[PDB]
Amino acid sequence: DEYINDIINKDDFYRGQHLIYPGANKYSHTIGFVYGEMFRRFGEFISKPQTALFINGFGFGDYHINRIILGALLNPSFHVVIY
Amino acid sequence: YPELKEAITKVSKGGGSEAEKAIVTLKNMAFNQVTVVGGGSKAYFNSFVEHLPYPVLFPRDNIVDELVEAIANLS
Ligand SMILES: NC(=O)c1ccc[n+]([C@@H]2O[C@@H](COP(=O)([O-])OP(=O)(O)OC[C@H]3O[C@@H](n4cnc5c(N)ncnc54)[C@H](O)[C@H]3O)[C@H](O)[C@H]2O)c1
């Protein structure tokens, strides 16, 4: 109701730090915090023992994920099925 | 001691150092607790490498180089 529609169809109307997407404002610590924390929870989640990880139907268009997986092979409980 | 027969020949013919006489006198014992090994390389350190047996249950396939090269290439 309030702001999305104006952005869509209000022509010349833009402002500063009001929206957070997609990975937009990383030069500001406040925003980055969110993505860094989600990735931190993900990375320390795979460190768990007896945990199953799934990578299904992925094009592997990212770089950090592949390198992290390669460096995290120390876990003998990695199983992957990809389409 | 690789120089086993040489010590025997020296003592039989005469001569030899104190170590040769000591090994000769302590080797003459006919006990199962003492083992005699002779050869040009059996008593050397090289022959000891192969004497180690692999564990029955421990895996024998080598998959460390594959992991290292995968990490080097993909990561
Ligand atoms: N907390 C986090 O997890 C985190 C961390 C850093 C960045 N980000 C976000 O990441 C930044 C950009 O990421 P992105 O959009 O480039 O990643 P992405 O969404 O493009 O990665 C997945 C993509 O791969 C495409 N693809 C191509 N071939 C495919 C195939 N055969 N199978 C499946 N998918 C295939 C898909 O269209 C699409 O899903 C954003 O700016 C930011 O919001 C998130």
Side-chain angles (χ1 to χ4, degrees):
Chain A
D1 279 326
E2 284 187 357
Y3 78 90
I4 287 175
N5 194 43
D6 298 335
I7 297 169
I8 290 287
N9 292 344
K10 191 58 69 68
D11 298 331
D12 292 331
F13 162 71
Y14 193 74
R15 269 261 302 287
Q17 295 166 10
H18 186 274
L19 299 180
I20 302 156
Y21 62 99
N25 292 317
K26 284 180 181 72
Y27 39 82
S28 288
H29 61 282
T30 56
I31 296 89
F33 180 49
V34 177
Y35 312 105
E37 289 291 300
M38 284 162 192
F39 206 102
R40 200 189 70 199
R41 169 52 71 115
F42 168 50
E44 290 155 12
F45 155 86
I46 56 165
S47 311
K48 283 200 299 178
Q50 297 280 322
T51 312
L53 186 68
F54 295 84
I55 302 160
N56 177 272
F58 194 49
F60 295 85
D62 200 321
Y63 160 64
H64 274 238
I65 289 160
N66 273 10
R67 183 272 306 278
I68 292 289
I69 290 159
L70 265 295
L73 295 173
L74 301 150
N75 196 13
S77 309
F78 173 63
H79 306 254
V80 64
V81 185
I82 294 152
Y83 277 60
Chain B
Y1 192 38
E3 304 296 327
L4 185 68
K5 288 168 69 173
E6 281 72 351
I8 292 160
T9 57
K10 287 167 191 177
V11 297
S12 73
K13 171 166 157 192
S17 71
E18 287 80 2
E20 275 64 8
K21 296 169 182 164
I23 189 80
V24 162
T25 184
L26 71 92
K27 175 260 190 173
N28 266 313
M29 188 182 287
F31 269 43
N32 290 71
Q33 300 162 231
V34 187
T35 311
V36 186
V37 184
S41 287
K42 297 162 145 175
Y44 277 32
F45 171 75
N46 282 332
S47 302
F48 160 73
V49 181
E50 287 79 0
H51 301 164
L52 268 62
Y54 270 113
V56 179
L57 267 73
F58 192 84
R60 281 168 86 187
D61 186 15
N62 300 323
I63 47 167
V64 302
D65 299 319
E66 193 173 325
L67 201 74
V68 168
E69 59 85 30
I71 292 156
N73 193 3
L74 271 164
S75 166

